[PDB]
Amino acid sequence: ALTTDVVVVGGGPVGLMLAGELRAGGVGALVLEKLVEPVGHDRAGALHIRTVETLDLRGLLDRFLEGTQVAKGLPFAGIFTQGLDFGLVDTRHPYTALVPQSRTEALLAEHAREAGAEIRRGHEVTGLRQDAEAVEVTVAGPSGPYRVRARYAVGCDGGRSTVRRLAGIGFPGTEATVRALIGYVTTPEREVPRRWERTPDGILVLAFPPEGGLGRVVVIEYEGPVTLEDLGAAVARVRGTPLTLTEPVSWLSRFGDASRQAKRYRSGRVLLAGDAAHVHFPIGGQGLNTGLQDAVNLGWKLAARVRGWGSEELLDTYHDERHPVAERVLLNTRAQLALMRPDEQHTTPLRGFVEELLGTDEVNRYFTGMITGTDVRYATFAPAARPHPWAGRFAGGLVLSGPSGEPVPVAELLRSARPLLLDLAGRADLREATRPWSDRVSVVAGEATVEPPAQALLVRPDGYVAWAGSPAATADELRASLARWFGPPA
Amino acid sequence: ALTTDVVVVGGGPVGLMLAGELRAGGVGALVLEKLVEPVGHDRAGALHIRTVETLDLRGLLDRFLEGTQVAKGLPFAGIFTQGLDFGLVDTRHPYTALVPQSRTEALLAEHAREAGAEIRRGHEVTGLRQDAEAVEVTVAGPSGPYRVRARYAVGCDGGRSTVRRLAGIGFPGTEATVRALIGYVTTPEREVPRRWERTPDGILVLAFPPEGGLGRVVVIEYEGPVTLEDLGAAVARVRGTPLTLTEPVSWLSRFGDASRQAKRYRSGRVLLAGDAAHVHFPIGGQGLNTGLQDAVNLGWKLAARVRGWGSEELLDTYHDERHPVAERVLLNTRAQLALMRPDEQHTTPLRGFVEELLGTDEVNRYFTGMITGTDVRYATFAPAARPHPWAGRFAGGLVLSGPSGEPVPVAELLRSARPLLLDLAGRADLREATRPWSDRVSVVAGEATVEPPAQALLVRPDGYVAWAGSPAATADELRASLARWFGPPA
Ligand SMILES: Cc1cc2nc3c(=O)[nH]c(=O)nc-3n(C[C@H](O)[C@H](O)[C@H](O)COP(=O)(O)OP(=O)(O)OC[C@H]3O[C@@H](n4cnc5c(N)ncnc54)[C@H](O)[C@@H]3O)c2cc1C
Ligand SMILES: Cc1cc2nc3c(=O)[nH]c(=O)nc-3n(C[C@H](O)[C@H](O)[C@H](O)COP(=O)(O)OP(=O)(O)OC[C@H]3O[C@@H](n4cnc5c(N)ncnc54)[C@H](O)[C@@H]3O)c2cc1C
């Protein structure tokens, strides 16, 4: 603990989000980032519903939306006529925010710094040891190698995670069989169809202004340096007729569908988040979404463990909750690849039937919820009998009515990163019962009718419901949940 | 017309069904069959809900069920845990009848003969000409070649249809890329897993008694003579470990997924039915079902045309109605092939999600209806405004209450192969209005509440609703439908 409470390995968007969260939880966070200067990415990032809702309860949503384009729908597996309908899901943010990942990275960096996280760029982690008392990290710095001692170390260091490998955590999954190229390059052609198309030999996504010039190319066919020539050639194989790509080249890269996940998100004092914990083909823009939400899930649990009121069991719920979520993201990207397989004989007809189905609200809601994260709910600390219908559900989008009729968004209340007891129906017995926890937990009265009904919601710092009360609920049950979740009464 | 009213080319199950129907319509039917003796097939035929319902209204269902096994469900695209649920569909025959096609062929032959159809075996059709007055067929018979003159010729002569080719009707579609082998052979192995399995290299379906001996093998990998050695080898490639197949061999055959459909089901005095009209991979046992229903659709329309009260327009509704149906069967078999593709990287995960979906009633009902034929309804002779919700729907499964409370299955009423006017709510105005059509159309009073509501149903000889009356319906509307469908009043 000598150097800092928590060392974050990697200053990508996920590490920076995690450091923000740790600071909001009142503990020290040191971010060791390998690069001296951020690289640049695909400039077409997407932040989906549940990520947007999460940013809102952190008070970050506004700056993320400054000068931002949004989308009110999304195609599924390259199917556009019957796309994902954001209106069928319960949310007050029915849109995807189109924010370039580099901007997301800059914003989170600014925030993390403003919150008192120390960021060190050009410090690469080369070694990692842990014992009962603490974690030591070996870093390549200014006078060469030095050691950092901390209570916990979190690897948010990407798919090629150093932390994961050195902690001895397995990364089971498949190897890539799909090869994709993506580039932002200029072109001498006009009225070029800005279409997403399947052909017999692959997938082509051309995005060029009708005048010609800088545009986005993505080509997919069923690591290493990419040239403007490779891109040009691949486009030809897939499209049939060659396309003239020329400089200036703003970006050239490759990626594949290797689908892997850390077997454990936690090993003693070491934990993983983001791509360090899971990799997959970037279909439907789900990767960073998952990672940012990994971080908000872990941040307050980790801060609570450091300060002494979070239990080991609590910290264990990080893996138990987030691992199933990423496992499903991996499966769905792989399934989408099957649906997009370039293949007129069988897959084209199969796509016809899927499209019909997407025209129905129930199935459409099914996939919308899957891609946008709105279907994420947790099953933590259940009885032991059955738990309340609201337990584990997301409450960050609820809006109460205050003493004088004015709205009270639960999102704005959670901005302090403290648990909330929402008293939806009176229940002064409950509010009184929570007082010995007043230092950790906030009590807030407000009228609201939810579905299914609830008289009270004990809400976690990440917007999910830890505990829900029915009329049958006794103050004693709440004291039990308060202890189990948030530690012993003062 | 000199030789017979209608010549049927081919004495497979579809030609024999059609000849039955033509006889029930009171016109002459001559069946020219190439083979001198029926060959043998896969002995695991399946007759699905809508075929079973059709057999019932023909009074054939009983003999088809004599000593017959039935199934109360079916897997979809090799998915068994969440199979097609027959209970979610509206029917009083929620089962598949497992009848070997050879038995179906024998029964229809017996029936066709008992009904006065002449069957000629070992007479192959070699030539076909038509003019305004009639159709001439050239046949290879006892004293060699002879000519048959008829008003209409129907090609029910299989996928390699002579009639289709000689009539100049195109057969657009795909060529086969999937190669399957199927055989009934004995084996020296015991406790052999009677499982349907996907592997990395194909699909294997083993069905052997735990003692060993005669069993069914199907192997699928993504024409010509098959040997016990070919079978044995293919099984090895797909399964990994070789399997000992030995004589006696009861059957050995191959098939593929060539997916083709006649562009026209009718060319003047020549029409097509069954495999002559459509071919596809035999996944989900839909081929003969479609063909038998093609025949019941055409039989009474064709008989009515010959006798003078069926219009050309009516006869045209054969193609208009049945062509869309087979087109969808082709698409769904091709789509199912995509779902079964042996492929762990993408298709396995995709199958997981489809399986979840099949666990929902709505989606399950969707596929059940597709495979069993229960979703078939027609859109014929519509306004011109909107048509009654019951128009085009299948009414063969309705059961009325008679004068004294006793049930009156609509299936038993249709057994005469005459149109029915069902008076569900009184409407003596309607019954009186139908009297000038009494020679073609039967009137039957009986109480029943249907959903959506209907006061009267004008029902076709194949069990589908030609016309439905609301309270607003006038006798004049019915006279109009009666004329358009069933010809001028007497
Ligand atoms: C083409 C493409 C498009 C995508 N589009 C989307 C999208 O639209 N929406 C979405 O949600 N996701 C998208 N993704 C996925 C998304 O980019 C990733 O999930 C995201 O980058 C994960 O962020 P991260 O911080 O976990 O890892 P990274 O961004 O990889 O950051 C890890 C950081 O750790 C540092 N590091 C590594 N090793 C060490 C070390 N030993 N010591 C110190 N530092 C180290 C690296 O320098 C890096 O800065 C896309 C991916 C691709 C390839
Ligand atoms: C392995 C397998 C399993 C199947 N399982 C099912 C199933 O479970 N359920 C289902 O509904 N379908 C199934 N099918 C499909 C089904 O068998 C066919 O759709 C069915 O045989 C079509 O019958 P048909 O009478 O139209 O054609 P056919 O059975 O091919 O009969 C055509 C007849 O025409 C004769 N003929 C051809 N040319 C001439 C000529 N020039 N002159 C005179 N006669 C001629 C032939 O001798 C033949 O008897 C399966 C198919 C296969 C391959």
Q: Where are the domains of chain A?
A: 1-177+257-378, 178-256, 379-490
Write the CATH number of the domain with boundaries A178-256: 3.30.70.2450
Our CA-based measurement puts residue B343 at a distance from the nearest CA of chain A, in whole angstroms, of: 9
Q: What is d(CA A99, CA B99) in angstroms, rounded to the nearest whole number? A: 61
Q: What is d(CA A273, CA A167) in angstroms, rounded to the nearest whole number? A: 14
Q: State the CATH class of domain A379-490.
A: alpha beta
Q: What is d(CA A368, CA A126) in angstroms, rounded to the nearest whole number? A: 41
Task: Say which residues have a Cβ less than 8 Å from residue B26's Cβ, sequence separation at least 6.
Answer: B303, B307
Does the C-beta of B12 come closer than 6 Å to ligand 2?
yes
Could you tell me where the beta strands, DSSP code E, fall in A142-245? 144-155, 173-174, 179-186, 196-199, 202-207, 215-221
CB B244 within 8 A of CB B188: yes
- Report the DSSP beta bridge partners of residue A307: none
Q: What is d(CA B237, CA B366) in angstroms, rounded to the nearest whole number? A: 35
Q: Where are the alpha helices (DSSP H) in B80-216?
A: 101-114, 162-167
Atom 17 in ligand 1: which residue has the minimum CA distance? A288
Does the C-beta of B157 come closer than 6 Å to ligand 2?
yes
Residue of chain B minimizing CA distance to A77? B350
Provide the experimental method for this PDB entry: X-ray
Q: What is d(CA A217, CA A20) in angstroms, rounded to the nearest whole number? A: 34
Q: What is d(CA A457, CA A424) in angstroms, rounded to the nearest whole number? A: 8
Is residue A46 a known part of a binding site? Answer: yes
Give me the torsion for CA of A284, A285, A290, A291, rounded to 10°: 160
Structure tokens at B145: 């070649």
Our CA-based measurement puts residue B382 at a distance from the nearest CA of chain A, in whole angstroms, of: 24
Is residue A37 a known part of a binding site? Answer: no
Which amino acid is it at A133?
A: E
- Report the DSSP beta bridge partners of residue B185: B215, B249
Q: What is d(CA A107, CA A115) in angstroms, rounded to the nearest whole number? A: 12
CB A459 within 8 A of CB A419: yes
Cβ count near A54 (within 10 Å) = 26
Q: Where are the alpha helices (DSSP H) in A184-244?
A: 228-239
- Report the DSSP beta bridge partners of residue A184: A216, A251
Could you tell me where the beta strands, DSSP code E, fall in A273-425? 278-279, 399-401, 407-409, 420-423
Q: What is d(CA B27, CA A252) in angstroms, rounded to the nearest whole number? A: 74
Which amino acid is it at A204?
A: L
Count Cα atoms within 13 angstroms, Cβ side, for A180.
18
3-state helix, strand, coil in chain A (%, to 5): 35, 25, 40
Resolution (angstroms) stands at 2.0
Cβ count near B477 (within 10 Å) = 16
Cβ count near A109 (within 10 Å) = 22
Q: What is d(CA A131, CA A341) in angstroms, rounded to the nearest whole number? A: 48
Structure tokens at B358: 């099949």
Cβ count near B363 (within 10 Å) = 19
DSSP B278-299: EE---TTS-HHHHHHHHHHHHH
Residue listed under structure tokens 């997009």: A340
Cα dist. B386→A424, B381, B382, B383, B390 in Å? 50, 11, 7, 6, 12
Residue listed under structure tokens 């902690």: A167
Q: Residue B113, SS3?
A: helix
Task: Say which residues have a Cβ less than 8 Å from residue A154's Cβ, sequence separation at least 6.
Answer: A6, A7, A8, A9, A15, A18, A163, A270, A271, A272, A273, A298, A302
Nearest by CB: A345 against B334, B346, B366: B334
Which amino acid is it at A333?
A: T
Q: Which ligand is nearest to the CA of A181?
A: 1
CB A6 within 8 A of CB A22: yes
Say if the Cβ atoms of A338 and B357 lie within 8 Å: no
The b/e string for A221-236 (b: 16+ C-beta within 10 A; e otherwise) is: bbeeebeeebbbebbe
Which amino acid is it at B332?
A: N
Could you tell me where the beta strands, DSSP code E, fall in B34-186? 69-71, 73-76, 79-85, 96-98, 118-121, 124-130, 135-141, 144-155, 173-174, 179-186
Atom 6 in ligand 1: which residue has the minimum CA distance? A285
Cβ count near B490 (within 10 Å) = 10
Q: What is d(CA A217, CA A282) in angstroms, rounded to the nearest whole number? A: 15
Structure tokens at A75: 């195609």
> Which of B370, B366, B271 has the alpha carbon at shortest distance from B329?
B370
Burial degree of A471 (CB within 10 A; 0-12, 13-18, 19+): exposed
Ligand 1 center to residue A164 CA distance, Å?
A: 15
Does the C-beta of A310 come closer than 6 Å to ligand 1?
no
Say if the Cβ atoms of A174 and B345 lie within 8 Å: yes
Q: What is d(CA B364, CA B385) in angstroms, rounded to the nearest whole number? A: 33
Cβ count near A10 (within 10 Å) = 28
Q: What is d(CA A48, CA A46) in angstroms, rounded to the nearest whole number? A: 6
**Rounded to 5°, angle at Cα A83 from A77 and A88:** 125
Say if the Cβ atoms of A335 and B357 lie within 8 Å: no
Does the C-beta of A162 come closer than 6 Å to ligand 1?
yes
Does the C-beta of A251 come closer than 6 Å to ligand 1?
no
Q: Residue A388, SS3?
A: coil
Q: What is d(CA B289, CA B325) in angstroms, rounded to the nearest whole number? A: 11
Site to probe by mutation for ligand 1, drawn from A102, A217, A275, A292 as the one with most ligand atoms within 8 Å of Cβ, is A275
Residue A373, sorted as left (phi over 0), alpha (psi -120 to 50) or beta, turns out to be left
Phi then psi dihedrals of residue B145, to 5 deg: -75, 135
Gaps in chain A (C–N > 2.5 Å) come after which residues? 222, 384
CB A440 within 8 A of CB A486: yes
Nearest by CB: B177 against A174, A257, A345: A345
Task: Say which residues have a Cβ less than 8 Å from residue B181's Cβ, sequence separation at least 6.
Answer: B217, B218, B219, B226, B230, B231, B234, B252, B253, B254
What is the DSSP secondary structure assignment for residue B452, as one 8-state letter?
A: S
Residue listed under structure tokens 């302090």: A416
Residue listed under structure tokens 């084996």: B187
Length in residues, chain A: 490
Does the C-beta of A15 come closer than 6 Å to ligand 1?
yes
> Which of B208, B198, B209, B211 has the alpha carbon at shortest distance from B239?
B198
Task: Say which residues have a Cβ less than 8 Å from residue A410's Cβ, sequence separation at least 6.
Answer: A57, A395, A396, A397, A398, A399, A400, A420, A422, A459, A463
Q: What is d(CA B129, CA B163) in angstroms, rounded to the nearest whole number? A: 10
CA B294 to chain centre: 6
A-chain CB neighbours of B337 within 8 Å are: 345-346
What does R_g of chain A's alpha carbons equal in angstroms?
Answer: 24
Q: What's the CATH superfamily of A1-177+257-378?
A: FAD/NAD(P)-binding domain (3.50.50.60)
CB A168 within 8 A of CB A200: no
Say if the Cβ atoms of A331 and B349 lie within 8 Å: yes
Say if the Cβ atoms of A338 and B335 lie within 8 Å: no
CB B171 within 8 A of CB B17: no
Which amino acid is it at A358?
A: L
Q: Where are the alpha helices (DSSP H) in B66-219?
A: 101-114, 162-167
- Report the DSSP beta bridge partners of residue A197: A204
Is residue B101 a known part of a binding site? Answer: yes
Q: What is d(CA B382, CA B378) in angstroms, rounded to the nearest whole number? A: 10
Task: Say which residues have a Cβ less than 8 Å from residue A362's Cβ, sequence separation at least 6.
Answer: B360, B362, B363
Length in residues, chain B: 490
> Which of A51, A76, A62, A99 has the alpha carbon at shortest distance from A363?
A76
CB B154 within 8 A of CB B7: yes
Q: What is d(CA A259, CA A173) in angstroms, rounded to the nearest whole number? A: 5
Q: Does residue A384 have a cis peptide bond before it, meaning omega lies within 30 degrees of 0?
A: yes
Which amino acid is it at B82?
A: Q
Q: What is d(CA A290, CA A279) in angstroms, rounded to the nearest whole number? A: 11
Phi then psi dihedrals of residue B172, to 5 deg: -65, 150
Give me the torsion for CA of A303, A27, A273, A267, rounded to 10°: -70
Report CA torsion sign: B356, B362, B368, B373. negative
Q: What is d(CA A327, CA A185) in angstroms, rounded to the nearest whole number? A: 34
CB B454 within 8 A of CB B461: no
Count Cα atoms within 13 angstroms, Cβ side, for A346.
21
The b/e string for A310-319 (b: 16+ C-beta within 10 A; e otherwise) is: bbeebbebbb
Structure tokens at B224: 């010509």
Structure tokens at A425: 């129906």
Q: What is d(CA B300, CA B441) in angstroms, rounded to the nearest whole number? A: 13
Ligand 1 center to residue A22 CA distance, Å?
A: 20
